[PDB]
């Protein structure tokens, strides 16, 4: 009667993966996709009722990615491979946008989890969690939307786990701390699959049994309204609670509201 749903958000930003490929390093996007597929197969093998979802984030949008081995896994892997090929090959850079649409992917994941929860029979509880692997730099323009997504996830009691590869993201740290998830930065990229299977594979009930690395130093720097930049000291309106970097005689937000 225990159902676990795992949604894996893959940072498929073409710029960062192209730079990684040009670096000629031992880790590429192909290995990341293979590790994600292996993690999904392991999650499906953990229990029959386990449900898997994979969402790939791109500059354009979010794509729902979902002989001798399991039949369902063979079908599942082929669909994911076809989707990732279709997304990347047909991805054409049209504009100067470079930040990853991480907030939209999380919103789609929340909508999918909400859809799946209703279809579950009332006798069983669907424990759901979201795992995010971060490759590109964080986007400060989507701060409010990201916070709204975090609050929505916390309201429905959905764990959010972040697997940072290259650069730490404050938004992911806040999401992990607020929702009670696990935040981890990968020291060695080629060993990504072992980290995923050792840390993020167990469910919340099993995480109590096991011993896990302590949470990293989570920051809580706020985003200014007129700059959308993280700040430590700033001016905050007492009515609308808006945050400003510099003092102003009149609040812009309160002036907007009539």
């Amino acid at each position: 009667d225990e159902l676990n749903l795992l949604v894996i958000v893959v940072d498929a930003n073409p710029i960062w993966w192209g730079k990684q490929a040009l670096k000629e390093s031992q880790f590429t996007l192909s290995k990341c996709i293979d590790a994600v597929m292996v993690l999904g197969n392991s999650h499906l093998f953990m229990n029959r009722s386990n449900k898997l979802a994979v969402i790939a984030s791109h500059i354009q949008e979010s794509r729902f990615l979902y002989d001798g081995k399991y039949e369902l896994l063979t079908s599942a892997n082929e669909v994911i491979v076809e989707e990732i090929k279709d997304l990347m090959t047909k991805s054409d850079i049209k504009g100067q946008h470079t930040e990853t649409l991480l907030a939209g992917s999380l919103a789609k994941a929340l909508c999918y989890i909400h859809r799946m929860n209703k279809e579950v029979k009332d006798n069983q509880e669907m424990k759901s969690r979201i795992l995010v692997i971060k490759a590109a730099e964080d986007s400060a323009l989507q701060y409010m939307n990201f916070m709204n997504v975090i609050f929505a996830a916390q309201k429905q009691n959905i764990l959010i786990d972040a697997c940072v590869l290259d650069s730490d993201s404050g938004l992911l740290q806040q999401a992990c701390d607020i929702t009670g998830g696990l935040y981890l930065k990968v020291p060695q990229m080629p060993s990504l699959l072992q980290y995923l299977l050792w840390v993020f594979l167990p469910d919340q009930d099993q995480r109590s049994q096991l011993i896990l690395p302590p949470p990293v130093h989570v920051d809580y720097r706020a985003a200014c309204f007129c700059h959308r930049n993280l700040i430590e000291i700033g001016y905050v309106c007492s009515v609308c609670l808006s945050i400003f970097c510099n003092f102003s005689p009149i609040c812009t937000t309160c002036e907007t509201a009539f």
Partner: protein, 191 residues
């Protein structure tokens, strides 16, 4: 005199603070009670390169992981590893014994009081407060030389692994930097 003495008698912690500030010539008794009262087309080239690379993509099984990588990751994730550092001031409750701890608390209280006075003086909007901030900085320097340097010597002699001095220096260094920046800005306004 009699009234002042009874106040210190009621609070021995304040009396020890009074001795550490007035007797040691750090501050005068007059000032003591005064406060008390992106890139070029290379990005497009990389995008095209990754698109071409992922056009011909095939899943792999052996290439995903190796025995050495898994062993190294487990060693890192084993207790006492890099990510699983289990010490984290293992016996800090028993280390740096309570005799040092009481002195550390007294130093923390003194630094907090002095910095509270300094930041209450800040910002300096009147010429009167200009001298008060200089006197506060002089008192801070005198207290540091009188207490922290012997404290640093005691720590070095006992070889404590905790960097108790470092945090106190950070606050004092930040205060000094803020004062220097404000003085520079004041000089800028006069240019």
């Amino acid at each position: 005199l009699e009234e002042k003495n009874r106040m210190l008698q009621e609070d021995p912690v304040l009396f020890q603070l009074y001795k550490d500030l007035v007797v040691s010539q750090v501050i005068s008794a007059e000032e003591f009670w005064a406060n008390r009262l992106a890139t070029s087309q290379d990005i497009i080239n990389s995008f095209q390169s990754i698109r071409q690379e992922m056009e011909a993509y095939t899943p792999k099984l052996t290439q995903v992981l190796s025995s050495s990588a898994a062993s190294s990751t487990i060693t890192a994730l084993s207790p006492g590893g890099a990510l699983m550092q289990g010490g984290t001031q293992q016996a800090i409750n028993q280390m740096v014994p309570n005799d040092i701890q009481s002195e550390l608390k007294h130093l923390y209280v003194a630094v907090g009081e002095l910095l509270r006075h300094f930041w209450s003086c800040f910002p300096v909007n009147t010429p009167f407060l200009e001298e008060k901030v200089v006197k506060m900085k002089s008192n801070l320097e005198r207290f540091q030389v009188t207490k922290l340097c012997p404290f640093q010597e005691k720590i070095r002699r006992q070889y404590l692994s905790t960097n108790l001095v470092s945090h106190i220096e950070e606050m004092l260094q930040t205060a000094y930097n803020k004062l220097h920046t404000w003085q520079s800005r004041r000089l800028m306004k006069k240019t």
